[PDB]
Amino acid sequence: EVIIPTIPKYANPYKLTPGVSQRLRTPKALYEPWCPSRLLLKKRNVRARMQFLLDVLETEKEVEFQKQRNYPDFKVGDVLDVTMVAAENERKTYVHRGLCIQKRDRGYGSSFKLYCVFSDSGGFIQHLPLCMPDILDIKIVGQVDYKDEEDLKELVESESRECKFLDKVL
């Protein structure tokens, strides 16, 4: 006439860290953000746990991307050669050469800006997500010196000595 409830088991015997996906230098967490509130040793806010849940998902996607691609650690002021696929033109491959004028390091949302000048048409700027699958390769080919951001902005507005390659290859 007595019904005993079921007690859940422990996933990792004698291990105090669940083993969630985090960056190498970050101290390891002690819980899984998707675990139900009822089964937690510490009852932390749902709102704070949802922020931690998104960080874990971002790191999982970043790990998969790094296994697929290997790009160099370029900086602002370097000249780059970028291989891209044009989905509009039946997924054809082209190679672009230009100067890197802006770089944002924001995890999975990282991006950079590529600048080039043509013989008659003038300057042309592109904004490219770094983790976009359309990009196939990136290489460093040179460097352009600048003093500060103001100097770099003046150079962009006044198109000069930025005509590495006149047209796109392939």
Partner 1 sequence: MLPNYSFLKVVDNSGAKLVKIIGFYGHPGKAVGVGEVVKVAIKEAKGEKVSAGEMKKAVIVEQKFPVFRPNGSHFRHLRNSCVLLSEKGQPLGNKVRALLTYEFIKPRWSKLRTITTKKLF
Partner 2 sequence: GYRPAKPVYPLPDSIASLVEDKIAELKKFGPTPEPALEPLPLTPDSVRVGCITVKAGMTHEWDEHGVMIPLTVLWIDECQVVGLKYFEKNGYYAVQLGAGCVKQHTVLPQIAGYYLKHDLPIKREMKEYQVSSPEALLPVGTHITAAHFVVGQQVDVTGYTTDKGFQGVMKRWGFKGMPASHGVSLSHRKPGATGGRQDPGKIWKEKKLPGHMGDEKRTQLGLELYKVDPKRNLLYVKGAVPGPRGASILVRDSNRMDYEERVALNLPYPTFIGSPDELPVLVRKSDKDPYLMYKKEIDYFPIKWK
Partner RNA sequence: CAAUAGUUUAAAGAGCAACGUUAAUAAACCGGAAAACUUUUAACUGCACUGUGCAGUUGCAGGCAAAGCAAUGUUCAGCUAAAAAAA
Binding site for partner 1 (CB under 8 A): 86-89, 92, 94, 118-129, 132, 134, 157, 159, 166-168
Check if the beta carbon of residue 124 is closer than 8 Å to that of residue 117: yes
8 binds partner 2 (CB under 8 A): no
Query: How many other CB atoms are there within 10 angstroms of residue 53's CB atom?
Result: 15
Q: Which pairing describes strands 78-86 and 123-129: parallel, antiparallel, or unpaired?
A: unpaired
Least Cβ distance, residue 87 to partner 2 (angstroms): 5
By rule CB under 7 A, what string of x and - marks binding of each residue 1-40 to RNA? Answer: ---------------------xx-xxxxxxx---------
Query: How many other CB atoms are there within 10 angstroms of residue 84's CB atom?
Result: 20
Check if the beta carbon of residue 93 is closer than 8 Å to that of residue 170: yes
Least Cβ distance, residue 70 to partner 2 (angstroms): 18
Pick the closest to residue 100 from 138, 157, 147 (CA basis). Answer: 138
Check if the beta carbon of residue 43 is closer than 8 Å to that of residue 32: no
Check if the beta carbon of residue 32 is closer than 8 Å to that of residue 19: no
Residue with smaller CB distance to partner 2, 61 or 153: 61
Query: How many other CB atoms are there within 10 angstroms of residue 68's CB atom?
Result: 8
By a kind-dependent CB cut-off of 5 to 8 A, residue 38 interacts, out of RNA, partner 2, partner 1, none, with: partner 2
Least Cβ distance, residue 47 to RNA (angstroms): 4
Binding interface with partner 2 (CB under 8 A): 34, 36-38, 43, 45-47, 50-51, 53-54, 57-58, 61, 85, 87-89, 108-109, 129, 132-134
> Which residues of the shown chain bind RNA in the complex (CB under 7 A)?
22-23, 25-31, 41-49, 51-52, 55, 58-59, 104-109, 111, 127, 129
